[PDB]
Design a protein around this motif. Structure first.
Motif, PDB file in Angstrom:
ATOM      1  N   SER A  98      -6.012   1.647  -0.783  1.00 16.58           N
ATOM      2  CA  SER A  98      -6.329   1.684   0.641  1.00 16.58           C
ATOM      3  C   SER A  98      -7.632   0.956   0.938  1.00 16.58           C
ATOM      4  O   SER A  98      -7.735   0.241   1.941  1.00 16.58           O
ATOM      5  CB  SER A  98      -6.413   3.131   1.122  1.00 16.58           C
ATOM      6  OG  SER A  98      -5.195   3.814   0.908  1.00 16.58           O
ATOM      7  N   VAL A  99      -8.635   1.126   0.072  1.00 16.35           N
ATOM      8  CA  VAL A  99      -9.919   0.457   0.260  1.00 16.35           C
ATOM      9  C   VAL A  99      -9.754  -1.054   0.161  1.00 16.35           C
ATOM     10  O   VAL A  99     -10.329  -1.808   0.956  1.00 16.35           O
ATOM     11  CB  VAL A  99     -10.946   0.984  -0.759  1.00 16.35           C
ATOM     12  CG1 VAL A  99     -12.303   0.333  -0.540  1.00 16.35           C
ATOM     13  CG2 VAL A  99     -11.052   2.497  -0.667  1.00 16.35           C
ATOM     14  N   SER A 100      -8.952  -1.517  -0.804  1.00  9.99           N
ATOM     15  CA  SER A 100      -8.712  -2.949  -0.960  1.00  9.99           C
ATOM     16  C   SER A 100      -7.970  -3.527   0.240  1.00  9.99           C
ATOM     17  O   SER A 100      -8.314  -4.612   0.729  1.00  9.99           O
ATOM     18  CB  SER A 100      -7.933  -3.209  -2.247  1.00  9.99           C
ATOM     19  OG  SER A 100      -6.570  -2.861  -2.090  1.00  9.99           O
ATOM     20  N   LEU A 101      -6.961  -2.809   0.740  1.00 12.18           N
ATOM     21  CA  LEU A 101      -6.237  -3.290   1.913  1.00 12.18           C
ATOM     22  C   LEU A 101      -7.134  -3.322   3.144  1.00 12.18           C
ATOM     23  O   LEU A 101      -7.090  -4.276   3.931  1.00 12.18           O
ATOM     24  CB  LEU A 101      -5.004  -2.426   2.169  1.00 12.18           C
ATOM     25  CG  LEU A 101      -4.153  -2.895   3.351  1.00 12.18           C
ATOM     26  CD1 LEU A 101      -3.806  -4.361   3.194  1.00 12.18           C
ATOM     27  CD2 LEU A 101      -2.892  -2.080   3.471  1.00 12.18           C
ATOM     28  N   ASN A 157      -9.612  12.618   3.640  1.00 17.96           N
ATOM     29  CA  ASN A 157     -10.153  11.757   2.594  1.00 17.96           C
ATOM     30  C   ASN A 157     -11.590  11.436   2.989  1.00 17.96           C
ATOM     31  O   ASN A 157     -11.846  10.463   3.708  1.00 17.96           O
ATOM     32  CB  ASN A 157      -9.302  10.502   2.428  1.00 17.96           C
ATOM     33  CG  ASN A 157      -9.622   9.743   1.156  1.00 17.96           C
ATOM     34  OD1 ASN A 157     -10.522  10.116   0.402  1.00 17.96           O
ATOM     35  ND2 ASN A 157      -8.873   8.678   0.901  1.00 17.96           N
ATOM     36  N   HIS A 158     -12.522  12.274   2.524  1.00 14.93           N
ATOM     37  CA  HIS A 158     -13.911  12.169   2.954  1.00 14.93           C
ATOM     38  C   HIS A 158     -14.548  10.868   2.489  1.00 14.93           C
ATOM     39  O   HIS A 158     -15.341  10.268   3.222  1.00 14.93           O
ATOM     40  CB  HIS A 158     -14.718  13.364   2.449  1.00 14.93           C
ATOM     41  CG  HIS A 158     -14.078  14.688   2.727  1.00 14.93           C
ATOM     42  ND1 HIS A 158     -14.237  15.355   3.922  1.00 14.93           N
ATOM     43  CD2 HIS A 158     -13.305  15.484   1.952  1.00 14.93           C
ATOM     44  CE1 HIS A 158     -13.571  16.494   3.881  1.00 14.93           C
ATOM     45  NE2 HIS A 158     -12.996  16.597   2.696  1.00 14.93           N
ATOM     46  N   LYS A 159     -14.211  10.412   1.280  1.00 13.05           N
ATOM     47  CA  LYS A 159     -14.777   9.164   0.773  1.00 13.05           C
ATOM     48  C   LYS A 159     -14.325   7.970   1.605  1.00 13.05           C
ATOM     49  O   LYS A 159     -15.144   7.123   1.983  1.00 13.05           O
ATOM     50  CB  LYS A 159     -14.400   8.958  -0.697  1.00 13.05           C
ATOM     51  CG  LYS A 159     -15.279   9.685  -1.721  1.00 13.05           C
ATOM     52  CD  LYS A 159     -15.029  11.185  -1.774  1.00 13.05           C
ATOM     53  CE  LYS A 159     -13.662  11.493  -2.362  1.00 13.05           C
ATOM     54  NZ  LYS A 159     -13.426  12.959  -2.479  1.00 13.05           N
ATOM     55  N   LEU A 160     -13.027   7.899   1.916  1.00 12.73           N
ATOM     56  CA  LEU A 160     -12.510   6.800   2.728  1.00 12.73           C
ATOM     57  C   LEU A 160     -13.082   6.837   4.140  1.00 12.73           C
ATOM     58  O   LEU A 160     -13.478   5.796   4.683  1.00 12.73           O
ATOM     59  CB  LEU A 160     -10.985   6.851   2.768  1.00 12.73           C
ATOM     60  CG  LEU A 160     -10.279   5.631   3.357  1.00 12.73           C
ATOM     61  CD1 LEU A 160     -10.659   4.372   2.598  1.00 12.73           C
ATOM     62  CD2 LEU A 160      -8.772   5.826   3.358  1.00 12.73           C
ATOM     63  N   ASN A 161     -13.148   8.031   4.741  1.00 15.02           N
ATOM     64  CA  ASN A 161     -13.705   8.157   6.084  1.00 15.02           C
ATOM     65  C   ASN A 161     -15.178   7.768   6.114  1.00 15.02           C
ATOM     66  O   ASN A 161     -15.620   7.063   7.029  1.00 15.02           O
ATOM     67  CB  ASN A 161     -13.516   9.582   6.600  1.00 15.02           C
ATOM     68  CG  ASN A 161     -12.059   9.942   6.790  1.00 15.02           C
ATOM     69  OD1 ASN A 161     -11.204   9.069   6.922  1.00 15.02           O
ATOM     70  ND2 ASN A 161     -11.769  11.236   6.811  1.00 15.02           N
ATOM     71  N   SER A 206      -2.754   3.186  11.337  1.00 14.16           N
ATOM     72  CA  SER A 206      -1.674   3.820  10.585  1.00 14.16           C
ATOM     73  C   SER A 206      -2.105   4.152   9.161  1.00 14.16           C
ATOM     74  O   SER A 206      -1.707   5.184   8.612  1.00 14.16           O
ATOM     75  CB  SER A 206      -0.443   2.917  10.576  1.00 14.16           C
ATOM     76  OG  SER A 206      -0.052   2.579  11.895  1.00 14.16           O
ATOM     77  N   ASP A 207      -2.920   3.287   8.549  1.00 15.57           N
ATOM     78  CA  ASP A 207      -3.422   3.552   7.205  1.00 15.57           C
ATOM     79  C   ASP A 207      -4.332   4.771   7.179  1.00 15.57           C
ATOM     80  O   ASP A 207      -4.235   5.604   6.271  1.00 15.57           O
ATOM     81  CB  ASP A 207      -4.164   2.330   6.673  1.00 15.57           C
ATOM     82  CG  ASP A 207      -3.234   1.306   6.072  1.00 15.57           C
ATOM     83  OD1 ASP A 207      -3.721   0.446   5.314  1.00 15.57           O
ATOM     84  OD2 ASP A 207      -2.020   1.360   6.358  1.00 15.57           O
ATOM     85  N   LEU A 208      -5.225   4.889   8.167  1.00 17.59           N
ATOM     86  CA  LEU A 208      -6.068   6.080   8.264  1.00 17.59           C
ATOM     87  C   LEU A 208      -5.242   7.340   8.486  1.00 17.59           C
ATOM     88  O   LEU A 208      -5.515   8.382   7.874  1.00 17.59           O
ATOM     89  CB  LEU A 208      -7.106   5.924   9.377  1.00 17.59           C
ATOM     90  CG  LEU A 208      -8.456   5.270   9.067  1.00 17.59           C
ATOM     91  CD1 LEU A 208      -9.183   6.175   8.094  1.00 17.59           C
ATOM     92  CD2 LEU A 208      -8.355   3.867   8.507  1.00 17.59           C
ATOM     93  N   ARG A 209      -4.223   7.261   9.346  1.00 15.87           N
ATOM     94  CA  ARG A 209      -3.382   8.426   9.607  1.00 15.87           C
ATOM     95  C   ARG A 209      -2.615   8.846   8.356  1.00 15.87           C
ATOM     96  O   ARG A 209      -2.549  10.036   8.028  1.00 15.87           O
ATOM     97  CB  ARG A 209      -2.425   8.133  10.762  1.00 15.87           C
ATOM     98  CG  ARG A 209      -1.523   9.298  11.125  1.00 15.87           C
ATOM     99  CD  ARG A 209      -0.289   8.830  11.873  1.00 15.87           C
ATOM    100  NE  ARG A 209       0.770   8.397  10.971  1.00 15.87           N
ATOM    101  CZ  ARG A 209       2.065   8.547  11.210  1.00 15.87           C
ATOM    102  NH1 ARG A 209       2.501   9.126  12.318  1.00 15.87           N
ATOM    103  NH2 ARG A 209       2.946   8.108  10.316  1.00 15.87           N
ATOM    104  N   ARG A 244       0.825  -1.206   0.000  1.00 17.16           N
ATOM    105  CA  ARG A 244       0.000   0.000   0.000  1.00 17.16           C
ATOM    106  C   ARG A 244       0.861   1.259   0.000  1.00 17.16           C
ATOM    107  O   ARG A 244       0.534   2.242  -0.675  1.00 17.16           O
ATOM    108  CB  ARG A 244      -0.949   0.001   1.197  1.00 17.16           C
ATOM    109  CG  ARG A 244      -1.999   1.105   1.142  1.00 17.16           C
ATOM    110  CD  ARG A 244      -1.671   2.264   2.072  1.00 17.16           C
ATOM    111  NE  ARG A 244      -2.467   3.443   1.760  1.00 17.16           N
ATOM    112  CZ  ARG A 244      -2.158   4.325   0.818  1.00 17.16           C
ATOM    113  NH1 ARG A 244      -1.075   4.186   0.070  1.00 17.16           N
ATOM    114  NH2 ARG A 244      -2.955   5.369   0.618  1.00 17.16           N
ATOM    115  N   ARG A 245       1.956   1.253   0.766  1.00 19.76           N
ATOM    116  CA  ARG A 245       2.886   2.383   0.732  1.00 19.76           C
ATOM    117  C   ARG A 245       3.563   2.502  -0.630  1.00 19.76           C
ATOM    118  O   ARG A 245       3.876   3.609  -1.082  1.00 19.76           O
ATOM    119  CB  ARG A 245       3.935   2.253   1.835  1.00 19.76           C
ATOM    120  CG  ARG A 245       3.373   2.138   3.237  1.00 19.76           C
ATOM    121  CD  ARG A 245       4.249   2.877   4.235  1.00 19.76           C
ATOM    122  NE  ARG A 245       5.556   2.251   4.380  1.00 19.76           N
ATOM    123  CZ  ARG A 245       5.869   1.377   5.326  1.00 19.76           C
ATOM    124  NH1 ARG A 245       4.989   1.002   6.239  1.00 19.76           N
ATOM    125  NH2 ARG A 245       7.097   0.867   5.357  1.00 19.76           N
TER     126      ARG A 245
END
Lengths: 427, 41, 69, 214
Positions: free
Chosen positions: A26-29, A66-70, A55-58, A19-20
């Motif tokens: 991020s969504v897939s992970l 990231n409004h869509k991810l949140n 850590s991914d969210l941070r 992912r890094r």
RNA sequence: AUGGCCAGAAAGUGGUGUUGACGCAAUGUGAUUUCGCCCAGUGCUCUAUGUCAAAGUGAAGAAAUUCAACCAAGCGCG
RNA sequence: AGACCCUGUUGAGCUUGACUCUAGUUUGACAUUGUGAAAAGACAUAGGAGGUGUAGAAUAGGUGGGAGCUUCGGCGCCAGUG
RNA sequence: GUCCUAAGGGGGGCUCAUGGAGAACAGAAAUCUCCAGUAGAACAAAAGGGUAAAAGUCCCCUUGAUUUUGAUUUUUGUGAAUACAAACCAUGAAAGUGUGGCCCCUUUAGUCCCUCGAAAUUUGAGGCUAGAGGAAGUUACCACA
């Protein structure tokens, strides 16, 4: 489940590394990590996956929110809470919301709604997690307030009076107690408090432990006090618990004090105060029991002063002659509180200097239920007009709210004149 | 608070169970079994 | 080497200036470790130039206490 | 902001509202306020009331929730009123209490019944922000209705924008200026930083283009 | 090998080096026979937010100046 | 006038995230430093578009006016749901 | 983080803690009556000193819990206390009593405060006055007096 612990930890770490490297999304992970976090029996694997998710969210919200991810992750947590109330898997949603809220990654009202559904749950641990979200954030709120504050004989008696006036000004402009952002951001606070009270506190079928019932009670009472709600059966519900034999009765008295506020009727609070006075402050009662009861009575009297009768208040103030220091200081605190608030109930011996002078001159007025300030003019406007007239007279030697524009320097001068007038009235 | 009396008076705390008396004797105990992890020779 | 200074070490640790700092405390030694390792260094009195003791060693007080019940 | 500017702004406001385009109803002049350098949740929400010298709102309907003597005074003064028996007939129904709160913009209660209002109407008036104002058996009911009509509320909440009615089109220009300046000055007094927190000020009628003071 | 480890105040300076991984350099252990796990801490080492010097940029002022972003390596994170 | 103990405004060797420094090293900027192309980022503006937890006719950032607007077909208020 | 670090003055009236004997419910303990009661009560020292037509308690008016200047004690300046001196008061019929409580850096302000030394102004700085706040070990390698 079947793989070696080190190998599966390396697999999760390699997925985070990819992912890094931006090989995977991020969504897939998150969607390949979160069900394993929910259903994994391995405690170390669950902790590591939770840490990688945080850590991914941070990292995702480090650049911008990231409004869509949140929104998608909050939707997943809400669906996990809604799918099974009796399941214990909602504690992961609670813990994730706590960590992201304390990292201030999530500040929108949707985590507040998610933890509202977490509070309105069947599982005891999920209820505890949501209640802790709304309650224990007050410590972080106090820390943030401290950070914001860090970012922001006759002469001695006059200096002490000025210090008292400064403390009064701080009380007039200093943030309200029990203040917390999620508690404000939740919608329908009256409905939420009523739902919690009916679901957990009213029901005798609820087999919650006493500390957890106290946590739910703390949430309900902070909601009632903070948003000035009216939940009448709660005050009748405290009746059986206001006994010195009851465990954690200090916590119960603190909850009742936080529940009390200004628009609560004196008719519903008075039986509680009478019961506290009878059970706690009596001739056979111990000194510690009397001190705790008088302290609770003082807290309730700060929140709503009209609960008392005059005879009961004079009786309780007479406990300052007690040989116990705790009972003495509690009674003196109650007397001082009624000295600023409502000195008419106090005896002429107990009123003090400023109370008797104010009652003689007529400035002090009786406090009434539902009475609000109705000042037609600004405070200190007469003093500001007098200062302007003095300046005009000095210029000649060498109504303001209706026509004159309020300069900020004029407002500062009016505030200084009001402070000087308050100091003169205190002197 | 630095004074050291010969006997310390216990303090009653409201909302908590009363402490057991100073002369109380507790006979409850827990035992753990020692095992030797060695196979038959 | 500004980062290896004791002040910068305490700031990166979280300790605020004004906390008690025992003499000899560094990265390898905490206050507990200093107090533990100074027990082996105890046992010497304080003398004048002529050799008479002006302050005694540890647990060698010379003072007779008041023993009442 | 200059007082002559206030005067000329309310001048074209009245000119448009009366001459250029007149609506079928009586428009209400209102002031919209923006905030800045402020936290709605971390800092205190200030609350205050100020009595305008003239009634800004001729069309307010005020309900009176009091005893029989106050009901007699209300019917003598030509003001509608409701009794505690009718409040009991409502039977604590949220829909009916919401309808009453929507129908009557303000409520005035006696001391003997104002302690019974939260146990009869529940949390409805507190939810609607319409808790009744006490009136005594010695105070004048008509006069009390007068300052209740003349009083506006300045309470802060979760957002940084506020709107307060300060007058209407038919009542005239000089006391319009007096009411607007009184509201602005009371706002500046309530603000902890004064003009350092005033983002924007704007007066407009009910259906009219805005006129910006700031 | 536009390299590693060292010398020199510097140098168009020098040692390994008339050298090239079966070499050079730094270490530990110390004939032959016999003889696991843990990266917890401290080291060493590989890879966008925080921390973030000087120079440079923007705003205010009549200027001195003040305030802002940006901000390499290192540290932190992994 | 040795060795041992004790004292010092003690001396010196050695060690370490003790203090203050420093050779070397590493990184950034300027100069050395010339002739050409291509890109992004950040501000400045000229704008434009959007909002589902459930319920609700709709897919409700919010606030304050408001029972009338109306392009004369209706949209409204009312009711319903929040 | 909340709470306590104490109401003084004048005048007037009355005695407190406790004991004995009595009164439907009422008894060990609710209110009422008499007698005895040198303080065994209270006064913000839990067994120190002092107070009974009060220094205690209640009632009525009041803020001497006010400005100004010296002197004395604890001992350069303080602070506290003690007699006053002047003004303004309060209370009481009045005598009187009452001036409290029984006993070195940082930063702010100065209109008419002074300097920046060739002259002036505006920022800035300095001064004076008046405030507010607050650098570790080892030596069994050793050496010296």
């Amino acid at each position: 489940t079947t793989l070696d612990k080190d190998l599966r930890e390396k697999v999760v770490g390699s997925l985070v590394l990819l992912r890094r490297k931006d090989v995977i999304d991020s969504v897939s992970l998150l969607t390949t990590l979160f069900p394993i976090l929910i259903s994994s029996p391995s405690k170390s694997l669950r902790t590591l996956i939770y840490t990688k998710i945080i850590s991914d969210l941070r990292e995702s919200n480090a650049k911008a929110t990231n409004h869509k991810l949140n929104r998608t992750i909050q939707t997943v947590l809400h669906n996990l809470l809604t799918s099974d109330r009796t399941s214990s898997k909602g504690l992961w949603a609670c813990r994730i919301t706590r960590e992201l809220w304390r990292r201030q990654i999530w500040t929108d009202a949707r985590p507040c709604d998610v933890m509202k559904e977490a509070c309105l749950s069947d599982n005891e641990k999920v209820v505890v997690g949501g209640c802790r979200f709304f309650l224990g954030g007050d410590k972080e709120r106090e820390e943030l307030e401290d950070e914001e504050s860090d970012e922001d004989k006759r002469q001695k008696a006059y200096e002490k009076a000025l210090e008292k006036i400064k403390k009064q000004e701080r009380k007039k402009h200093a943030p309200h107690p029990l203040n917390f952002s999620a508690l404000h951001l939740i919608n329908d606070p009256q409905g939420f408090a009523e739902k919690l009270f009916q679901k957990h506190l009213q029901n005798l079928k609820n087999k919650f432990t006493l500390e957890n019932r106290l946590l739910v009670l703390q949430l309900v009472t902070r909601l009632v006090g903070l948003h000035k709600l009216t939940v009448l059966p709660l005050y009748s519900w405290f009746v059986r618990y206001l006994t010195p034999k009851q465990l954690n009765v200090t916590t119960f008295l603190a909850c009742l004090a936080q529940a009390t506020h200004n628009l609560v009727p004196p008719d519903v609070i008075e039986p509680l105060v009478v019961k506290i006075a009878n059970e706690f402050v009596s001739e056979a009662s111990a000194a510690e029991v009397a001190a705790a009861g008088l302290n609770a009575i003082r807290e309730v009297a700060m929140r709503q002063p009209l609960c008392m009768s005059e005879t009961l208040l004079q009786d309780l103030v007479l406990y300052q002659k007690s040989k116990d220091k705790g009972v003495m200081m509690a009674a003196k605190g109650l007397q001082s509180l009624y000295r600023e608030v409502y000195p008419e109930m106090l005896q002429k011996k107990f009123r003090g200097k400023e109370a008797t002078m104010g009652l003689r001159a007529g400035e002090i007025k009786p406090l009434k239920f539902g009475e609000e300030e109705a000042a037609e003019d600004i405070e200190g406007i007469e003093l500001l007009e007098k200062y302007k007239e003095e300046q005009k007279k000095k210029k000649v030697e060498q109504k303001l709210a209706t026509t004159t524009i309020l300069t900020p320097a004029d407002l500062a001068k009016l505030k200084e004149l009001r402070q000087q007038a308050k100091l003169d009235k205190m002197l | 608070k630095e004074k050291q009396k010969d006997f310390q008076k216990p303090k009653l705390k409201v909302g908590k169970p009363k402490q057991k008396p100073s002369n109380f004797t507790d006979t409850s105990f827990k035992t753990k079994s020692i095992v030797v992890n060695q196979q038959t020779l | 080497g500004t980062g290896k200074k004791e002040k910068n070490r305490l700031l990166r640790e979280g300790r605020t200036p004004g906390d008690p700092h025992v003499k000899g405390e560094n990265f390898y030694r905490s206050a507990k470790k200093i107090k533990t390792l100074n027990i082996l260094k105890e046992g010497k009195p304080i003398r004048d130039s002529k050799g008479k003791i002006v302050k005694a060693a540890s647990f060698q007080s010379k003072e007779v206490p008041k023993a009442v019940i | 902001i200059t007082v002559a500017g206030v005067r000329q702004n309310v001048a074209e406001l009245l000119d448009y509202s009366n001459n250029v385009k007149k609506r079928n109803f009586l428009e209400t002049v209102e002031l919209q306020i923006g905030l800045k350098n402020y936290d709605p949740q971390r800092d205190k929400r200030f609350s205050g009331t100020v009595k305008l010298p003239t009634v800004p709102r001729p069309n307010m309907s005020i309900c009176i929730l009091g005893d029989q003597h106050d009901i007699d005074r209300a019917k003598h003064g030509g003001i509608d009123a409701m009794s505690a028996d009718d409040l009991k007939k409502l039977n604590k129904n949220k829909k009916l209490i919401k309808k009453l709160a929507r129908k009557y913009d303000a409520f005035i209660a006696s001391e003997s019944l104002i302690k019974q209002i939260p146990r009869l109407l529940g949390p409805g008036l507190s939810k609607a922000g319409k808790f009744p104002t006490p009136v005594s058996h010695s105070d004048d009911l008509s006069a009390k209705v007068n300052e209740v009509k003349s009083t506006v509320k300045f309470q802060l909440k979760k957002v940084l924008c506020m709107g307060v009615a300060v007058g209407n089109v038919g009542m005239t220009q000089e006391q319009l200026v007096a009411n607007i300046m009184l509201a602005i000055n009371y706002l500046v007094s309530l603000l902890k930083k004064g003009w350092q927190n005033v983002g924007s000020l704007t007066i407009k009628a009910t259906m009219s283009p805005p006129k910006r003071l700031y």
